[PDB]
Design a protein around this ligand. Structure first.
Ligand SMILES: Nc1ncnc2[nH]cnc12
Ligand SMILES: Nc1ncnc2[nH]cnc12
Lengths: 346, 346
């Protein structure tokens, strides 16, 4: 039902947004003084799954895990098995995103969408294959596979709204995944690879040329169509990137907010917004990733992150870190007194 | 005892910082990937009142309230009595900083250092006078008054460390106070008034020239010495700015972190750091204020805020908003697993 899913993403609710603006202007402060807390509160009020008001109930960070055949091109200094080890660490609460999610009172959902290892007990199993194809020589997956994964993850995501989740975050875990992320960013924005290829997980300065060349080769051989984000995902993305796009389609379909993380997630967000522009009003940035291509990706999303933390972990820890800011916008909205009640005219 | 206070601010503890760096590098993530969470955790580990480790116990936001005779120069469109009304609102929990402090689990301490109204029951009374002098025609206060206020507020601040507070935030509330803040910023940084004078609380575009002229007049008539921050405070600052400087001197003397808020607080921080450069390692930025002179002030502090919220409320709400980030750095530090325990070498 993918066509129906995309078709049925709701528009933001202009009426609820006008009522929200009106309330904010009347609060106990100079009009506009809380800046982007104000604009964030109105954006949230517009999302139909929030029931006409900025609010946060339960929070979930979905961490999408997979391996990538492009690891064989020597674009990642972390050994391949780190994806599987770290995915298992997610079930024990010891990773960055686990710790930051706990701090924010969010639950982490670890989803294996294609790790090249035995299944990890405890991890949600949506595995497409044991790793995707090497994008340097051919596609990451078939279109059927990318579509099926989008539908499954989007259904999983919107189903969490039944258990009270009203705010998602997304992240990805997959050795070498900054390579397809950079291929996709280059394709969607028209920037040359050299401008959007970063060091990812501490790649030595001397291997950057190889990684730029591998991105260009992937684009050259696959010839992804920039106007078909599912084509771009299936050809030069990865299962974890498709997985993050699926969380965004599902949150949007559910009329609910989703916090981006870093560059991996911006690449997925570019795909999501190409596939269904109606996704865009549900997306909330968290932080401004240290990765080279972060600025270019965020400009094409017309997004300005709240947090400048020079972070590049990418598995959702940035999204978790911004959940308190969303909660702060709701608290301001609901808990502030009003000017009129103090007799103050400004 | 002001000379003794300044003399006895402790140096950061290099040994504790080295032990902290070592621990962070060994955590379950690529080295350096949590970016400024890492550097923040080490900075905190260095502050002797934190006992050799990044941690947060109790949190306090001190909101310093006073009126300013420069209001008579027509530099503020908010009526003067708003300082007193809002200070009373602080005791009822309905202001921005109250709401955001509650969200962060911090307590707000509202301190009247010179409101031009009857005493507000419920507010800490350290009032120097009912408003300071009009800085456009003479000094805000005598040096004796500024010194006495610094000592009192710094003693109050460090005394909260007995009740378990380990993290402060600062803010100010005072109609017209962006005028002395801009005078001080101009004096300490050598920037012309026109570069650092902002709209404060929604001053109409057409009154900006007057406010620039009033800043220049204040500097011209008082001739504050840029190398004596107490001179600058007493001549062209205000009681609320001196009050914020006092919180920074006291937190530093106590070897404890203090979160800045916006432009008002940056002006106080410039004074604090001129008076005692040993204050600087205790200061943590929160957000990048929307005020015109924010960039210049923060450059002279070599500070890069975490949060880009286009905020300009200024009464501590920014400081409260960043308390979760400090807590997040401690959680990362204490709660993450270690690479070695997973057999991972990167
Ligand atoms: N000008 C202003 N009006 C109302 N509340 C405030 N808090 C800080 N500044 C203020
Ligand atoms: N390269 C990497 N190593 C360890 N943990 C991670 N989490 C995300 N990326 C990682």
């Amino acid at each position: 039902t993918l066509h129906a899913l995309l078709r049925d993403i709701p528009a933001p609710d202009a009426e609820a947004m006008a009522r929200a603006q009106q309330h904010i202007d009347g609060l106990l402060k100079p009009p506009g003084s809380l800046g982007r807390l104000e604009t964030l509160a109105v954006q949230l009020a517009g999302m139909p799954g929030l029931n006409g008001t900025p609010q946060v109930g339960e929070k979930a960070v979905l961490v999408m895990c997979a391996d990538h055949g492009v690891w064989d091109e020597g674009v990642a200094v972390s050994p391949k098995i780190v994806t599987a080890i770290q995915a298992a660490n997610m079930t024990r609460g010891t990773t960055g995103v686990c710790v930051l999610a706990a701090q924010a009172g969010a639950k982490v959902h670890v989803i294996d969408v294609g790790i090249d290892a035995e299944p990890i007990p405890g991890v949600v199993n949506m595995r497409v294959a044991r790793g995707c194809g090497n994008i340097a020589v051919g596609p990451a997956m078939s279109r059927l596979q990318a579509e099926a994964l989008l539908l499954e993850v989007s259904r999983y995501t919107c189903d969490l709204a039944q258990r009270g989740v009203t705010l998602f975050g997304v992240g990805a875990l997959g050795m070498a995944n900054t390579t397809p992320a950079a291929a996709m960013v280059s394709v969607f924005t028209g920037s040359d690879a050299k401008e959007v290829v970063g060091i990812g997980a501490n790649l030595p300065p001397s291997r950057i040329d190889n990684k730029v060349d591998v991105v260009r080769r992937a684009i050259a051989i696959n010839q992804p169509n920039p106007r078909d984000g599912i084509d771009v995902l299936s050809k030069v993305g990865g299962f974890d990137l498709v997985g993050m796009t699926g969380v965004m389609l599902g949150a949007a379909r559910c009329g609910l907010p989703v916090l981006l993380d870093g560059f991996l997630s911006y690449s997925a967000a570019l795909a999501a917004c190409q596939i269904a522009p109606a996704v865009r009003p549900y997306l909330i940035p968290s932080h401004f990733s240290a990765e080279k291509g972060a600025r270019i990706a965020l400009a094409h999303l017309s997004m300005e992150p709240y947090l400048h933390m020079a972070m590049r972990l990418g598995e959702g820890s940035g999204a978790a870190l911004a959940m308190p800011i969303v909660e702060a916008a709701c608290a301001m909205f609901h808990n502030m007194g009003e000017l009129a009640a103090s007799n103050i005219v400004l």
